[PDB]
Design a protein around this nucleic acid. Structure first.
Lengths: 53, 128, 388, 250, 224
RNA sequence: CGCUCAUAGCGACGCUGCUUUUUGAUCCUUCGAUGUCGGCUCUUCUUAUCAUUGUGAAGCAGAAUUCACAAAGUGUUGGAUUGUUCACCCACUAACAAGGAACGUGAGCUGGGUUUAGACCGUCGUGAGACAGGUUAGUUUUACCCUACUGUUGUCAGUUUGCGUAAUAGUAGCAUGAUUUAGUACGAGAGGAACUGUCAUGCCGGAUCACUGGUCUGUAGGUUUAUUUGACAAAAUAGUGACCUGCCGCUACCAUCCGUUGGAUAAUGGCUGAACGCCUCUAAGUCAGAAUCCAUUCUAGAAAC
RNA sequence: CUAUGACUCUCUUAAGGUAGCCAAAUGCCUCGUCAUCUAAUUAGUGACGCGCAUGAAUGGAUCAAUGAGAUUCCCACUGUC
């Protein structure tokens, strides 16, 4: 198992959405809510349901 | 060799030529391996060998029908271990009929594409 | 002229009458062909499709690219409460086919099995189904006729089927009509098959005895009824373009001027779903234990390398189902029908000896996240120690 | 506006045509696809037979037949089967629906024959395929005319690449070495195919013969003396330039 | 010595097996056992471990291990390292670096004394590679590279570059690294080097299409 | 002709046929009206077989190719130009075979063309006007009937119901690539296989909703626009105001699973063996054998039990 | 220089296509030929003109601005596919 990147959520097998960027950084999003909030470029410290909060 | 990845590059899809040989994009005109099925567009997944022309690049290679590898695509495919993956942009890299990349690949190369073709692994920096 | 561009046919014709299945639960219309080499055993069962989950396992296919590597595989959970055997029936071979011969019943018929005979059970005051029959066991001028009825079966006829029925009432759907079907016994020497019949009257048969572990079974069922559906979504027909007048979700041409009737092979709009279908080679990954009605929670979804005392049930239970509290069996891939539907499992028609029959499953993970959303937790206690 | 069967259509045909333009008008007739080179060589093909129709045409695509108002004015006659002979001899072969094919495929048959005759490369001279000069004749930018003769047209395409490149325009010579026993059925195959000199055959040693061959015919003769024999046979160069090839400029 | 070999007739054996000074890894090859022919040559020493890394068949130019440290990326599985750490006896510190900018075989060309570096290696990798390999690292690119691994093949007493490499790089790479150089290209169909040959102090498993006169050229710096 | 060699493959000079997928010929039906090109769509039939299966021949060493047979079970593509049928290219491919069905298919569509009325130009005509020349714009009506088909109730000629049998009808899996074989057989070399096994894919089929994506009247939660309720709060109206996230559900090679084995045959290769003291696969008998046929499994379950 | 056809005559019917322009909405052959756009173009555009059958208020050539006019292409954008 792994940990989500944007929020620091725990990711079990086959409940992720892995995304790899042009700068060769790879991100593991846990669902497309976290993916939407990553692609709007909001800080995780702004929202209050993440594990970075 | 390798499995079925989700095909999200049909015929007529431009993609960025991640290759230090002279192209700026690659326009996929057909995929090597597609047969049949009335009115279906030949799609390319990752790992596929495509017949492609360049619509933007060095003019000494610009109207030829050349061969390319799809090394990343942003249509999400699940590997069979359960994890999905999707890249940022569609991309390609020019080769010979055999599959010899003679240049250097830039950006991340999907590891469903460094499987079938050895020389796509030996010119990749990041294999993801 | 002719068909200009050649394309494969839209639809199978081996499924062609496409109507609603007359069997509410799935009919085994063919049983595995009997060999007298083997011992006596049943060959069918009746589960209920609880839900679906995904498991993680390490593949043991040598030569593949996934080999000794983890794979997320989806599995459906078929909950199999134990089946009561309640009679036996003989079948003599005739020139027109097998025919029902004498039908020996048992004595303590359950009040759930007797509900199949009764369409209006509540209006009936004295439920008089199988009451003059059970009084044959009281005297011995009637009990003598049971043995002379049974020696007719173990001499004159060739197929021995036990009339077996389930316990819907033990799992709470809303049903008390206990689903009943004949399971043909498949062993040598008919005087052993009727022996295995009468030595199982009023006793239950668990799914772990009929079906082994790591084996391929067939799943007979009735698919999800999607009602009167048009021809695209029923057959697969390419949509007509944006400009069409009368409608674009049609077969355009339904025939030439020259047969001069519409063929039975033209795609037409009609019923989807509630089709009787079987599915062969669905490998069982795990047969789960029963959970006790007096004792602790048996950790059914506990696997090796996981060590979490948890059920096969996810958080909040299976969606649109209860909890799996009786014996289950989880087999790879999907099966016909939704949740809460009776499935007739069946041992395979031929004995498979391929690769998947010789596969041995060792699950490492079973996902019990809440599939009523996107649960990021496994057990209900990890949730409370996570946001506490 | 909504007639139940639409009107007349074009007269598409498979039939050759000859032109004669007389007194201001353009007269053609329908003929055969090959039997008009069977008429202008002095050979007889039975004047009934050389025509697909005897009535004289204004336009052979429009299917328009002339009239005696504009025929006694033009030819000085009105008898059509004498008109059709003057149009046949004193005309020029015009071209049907397949004109673009029988001209483009003709000018792509011409470059695929006359350019490939006798041409060896630089650097210890060897022949090669046709597509190398199919590159290097568009590369010299040749425009092909047919009215100059084909041998003269052969002598014209190699003049430009003697001017441009370093290529040889003559025969060559080879010294074939073959063993005695397993090479005589290789001898009598090429002996009525090409010219020989210095036939020096032994019993104990190898048949050595010398050749009179063009420059281009060598690549066949390198392979045909192995694919018939089944063993090794030796190619030894004799001489690189002999006359009476195209060096006489016929 | 410098022997021809192919992986499923796609001759580039320099990626599907790494032949280091210890612990020759080999690819999976769900086929004929590819490791069996290399084990007929390495049953003496240098144990073959038949592990695949990251799911992918390449291990030679996806893991770039020395005698003193094997490297695996952040895509590798904990069970694959649980097999790799167990398949060889205790001499090494196998270190999974938390790099994800690159794939680790093509971006460091390693050696028992002094290794090479793809320029933007992100100095976290520099400190952890000086920890677990103990070798000097130089962020250099040859005239035919910016990815300095798998365009050059590094061993002890020998190395290789291309004939599309300038002399100015070869002289400084003999000066700084202190290893003699030949500009020969393995496997005359292609250009890259460490897809063709993997080198020990005893042998060099080399791709099958390689010409024998060039095999003599590269063996006259790999062997001696 | 094919080095020699008529018939491996062809085959002039002639002759004998078939086909109705070309165009003629004719005018038998239809002018109180059969909607006429092409394409899209969809089904079925044909074999004159392109590939696939089994075989036999070759100028079949291997590879590649060519001829024929049993074979129509299963496939037979994406595109640029053109209204096009046809044509001609580019690219994939196991192969991109030829065809019918009222030149299948306009109450199925489109209307590009043809084909009304407007108009332009060229040539012809004094002119009105002609063109079977080019261009441009130009209404595509009705099913609710009967049948056919697809489904759905319903009557069953001791009552109600249970569990079944399976007549008859349909029928589904086809095909490829890599690799082991093996750089081995074959070959002087160049090149370079085959059977079995393994792994994947293409197309089709049947399901499915654990994942991933889409959808969002769950008007679920939030942001927010204009107005209205005096302000806050909470509401509404703007036909669901818009946007963000999103259950359940439905869904997609955009995701997942699954898609068998026996008998008889054809082609042909044969055995025993006559006719015809010998020979002969054939005449009496007989053997193996095809993607075939029939069952198996699958779908329905009859004025059948 | 027999290619070009000045020149030279006759002929119907007075004269013999000047400057321009074009496979043009005008060109049969025709999917003309050369280049170009394309991977591939019966399309588009630029050139060539013995032009079936262009051409000077039957108006020729050009042409900014404008067009619910006709055609072709590149970018954006989309369920057109």
């Amino acid at each position: 198992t792994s940990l989500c990147n944007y929020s620091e959520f725990k990711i079990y097998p086959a409940r992720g959405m892995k995304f790899v960027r042009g700068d060769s950084k790879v991100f593991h999003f846990i669902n497309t809510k976290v993916e939407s909030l990553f692609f709007r470029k909001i800080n995780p410290r702004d929202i209050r349901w993440s594990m970075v909060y | 060799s390798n499995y079925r990845v989700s095909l999200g590059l049909p015929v007529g899809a431009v993609m960025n030529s991640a290759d230090n040989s002279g192209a700026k994009n690659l326009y996929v005109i057909a995929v090597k391996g597609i047969k049949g099925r009335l009115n279906r567009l030949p799609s390319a997944g990752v790992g596929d060998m495509v017949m492609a022309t360049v619509k933007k690049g060095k003019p000494e290679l610009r109207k030829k029908v050349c061969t390319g590898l799809v090394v990343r695509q942003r249509k999400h495919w699940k590997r069979k271990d359960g994890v999905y993956i999707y890249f940022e942009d569609n991309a390609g890299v020019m080769c010979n009929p055999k599959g010899e990349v003679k240049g250097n690949i830039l950006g991340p190369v999907a590891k469903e594409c460094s499987d079938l073709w050895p020389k796509v692994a030996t010119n990749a920096g990041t294999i993801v | 002229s002719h068909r200009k561009f050649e394309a494969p046919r839209h639809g199978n014709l081996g499924f062609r009458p496409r109507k609603r299945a007359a069997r509410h639960q799935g009919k085994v219309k063919s049983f595995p062909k009997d060999d007298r080499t083997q011992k006596v055993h049943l060959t069918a069962f009746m589960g209920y499709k609880a839900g679906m989950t995904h498991v993680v396992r390490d593949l043991e296919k040598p030569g593949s690219k996934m080999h000794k590597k983890e794979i997320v595989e989806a599995v459906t959970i078929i909950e199999c409460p134990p089946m009561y055997i309640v009679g036996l029936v003989g079948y003599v071979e005739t020139a027109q086919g097998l025919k029902t011969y004498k039908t020996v019943w048992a004595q303590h018929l359950s009040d759930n099995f007797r509900r199949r005979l009764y369409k209006n059970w509540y209006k009936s005051k004295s439920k008089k189904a199988f009451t003059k029959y059970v009084k044959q066991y009281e005297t011995e001028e009637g009990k003598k006729s049971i043995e002379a009825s049974l020696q007719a079966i173990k001499k004159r006829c060739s197929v021995v089927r036990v009339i077996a029925h389930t316990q819907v009432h033990k799992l709470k759907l809303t049903q008390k009509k206990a689903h009943v079907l004949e399971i043909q016994v498949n062993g040598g020497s008919i005087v052993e098959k009727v022996n295995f019949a009468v030595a199982n009257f009023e006793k239950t048969v668990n799914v772990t005895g009929v079906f082994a572990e790591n084996e391929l079974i067939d799943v007979i069922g009735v698919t999800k009824g999607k009602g009167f559906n048009g021809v695209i979504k029923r057959w697969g027909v390419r949509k007509l373009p944006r400009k069409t007048h009368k409608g674009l979700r049609k077969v355009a041409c339904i025939g030439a001027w020259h047969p001069s009737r519409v063929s039975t092979t033209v795609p037409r709009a009609g019923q989807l779903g509630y089709h009787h279908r079987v599915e062969r080679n669905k490998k069982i990954y795990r047969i789960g234990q029963a959970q006790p009605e007096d004792g602790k929670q048996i950790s059914t979804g506990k696997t090796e390398f996981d060590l979490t005392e948890k059920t096969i049930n996810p958080m909040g239970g299976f969606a649109h189902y209860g909890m799996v509290k009786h014996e289950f069996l989880m087999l790879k891939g999907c099966v016909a029908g939704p949740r809460k539907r009776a499935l007739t499992l069946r041992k395979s028609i031929t004995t498979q000896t391929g690769r998947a029959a010789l596969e041995k499953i060792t699950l490492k993970f079973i996902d019990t996240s809440s599939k009523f959303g996107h649960g990021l937790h496994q057990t209900a206690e990890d949730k409370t120690k996570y946001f506490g | 506006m909504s007639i139940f069967t639409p009107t007349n259509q074009i007269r598409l045909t498979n039939v050759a045509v000859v032109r004669m333009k007389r007194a201001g008008k353009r007269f053609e007739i329908a003929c055969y696809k090959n039997k008009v080179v069977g008429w202008r060589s002095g050979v007889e093909k039975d004047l009934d037979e050389v025509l697909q129709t005897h009535s004289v045409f204004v336009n052979v695509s429009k299917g328009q037949v002339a009239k005696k108002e504009d025929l006694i004015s033009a030819f000085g006659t009105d008898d059509q089967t004498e008109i059709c002979k003057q149009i046949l001899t004193k005309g020029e072969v015009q071209v049907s629906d397949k004109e673009r094919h029988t001209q483009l495929e003709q000018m792509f048959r011409d470059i695929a024959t006359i350019v490939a005759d006798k041409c060896v490369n630089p650097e210890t001279k060897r022949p090669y395929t046709v597509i190398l000069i199919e590159r290097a004749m568009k590369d010299i930018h040749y425009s092909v005319k047919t009215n100059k003769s084909t041998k003269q047209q052969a002598l014209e395409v190699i003049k430009q690449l003697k001017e441009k490149m370093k290529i040889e325009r003559a025969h060559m010579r080879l010294r074939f070495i073959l063993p005695v026993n397993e090479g005589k059925k290789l001898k009598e195959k090429l002996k009525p195919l090409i010219k020989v000199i210095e036939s020096e055959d032994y019993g104990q040693q190898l048949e050595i013969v010398c050749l009179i061959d063009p420059g281009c015919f060598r690549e066949i003769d390198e392979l045909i003396k192995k694919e018939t024999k089944g063993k090794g046979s030796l190619e030894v160069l004799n001489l690189k330039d002999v006359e009476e090839g195209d060096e006489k400029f016929e | 010595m410098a022997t021809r070999l192919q992986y499923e007739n796609s001759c580039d054996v320099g990626v599907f097996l790494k032949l280091t000074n210890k612990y020759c890894l080999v690819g999976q090859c769900g086929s004929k056992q590819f490791l069996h022919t290399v084990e007929n040559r390495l049953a003496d020493h240098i144990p073959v471990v038949e592990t695949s890394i990251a799911g992918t068949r390449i291990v030679g130019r996806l893991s770039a291990g020395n005698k003193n440290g094997l490297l695996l990326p952040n895509t590798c599985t904990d069970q694959e390292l649980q097999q790799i750490r167990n398949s060889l006896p205790d001499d090494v510190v196998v270190q999974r670096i938390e790099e994800k900018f690159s794939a680790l075989g093509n971006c460091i060309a390693t050696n028992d004394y002094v290794a090479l570096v793809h320029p933007d290696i992100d100095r976290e990798t520099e400190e952890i590679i000086a920890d677990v390999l103990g070798v000097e690292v130089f962020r250099q690119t040859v005239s035919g590279n910016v990815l300095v691994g798998t365009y050059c093949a590094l061993t002890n007493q020998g190395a290789l570059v291309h004939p599309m490499t300038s002399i100015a790089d070869q002289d400084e790479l003999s000066s700084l690294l202190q290893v003699p150089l030949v500009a020969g290209t393995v496997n005359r169909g292609n250009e890259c080097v460490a897809a063709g040959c993997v080198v020990n102090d005893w042998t060099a498993i080399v791709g099958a299409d390689t010409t024998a006169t060039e095999i003599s050229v590269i063996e006259s710096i790999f062997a001696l």
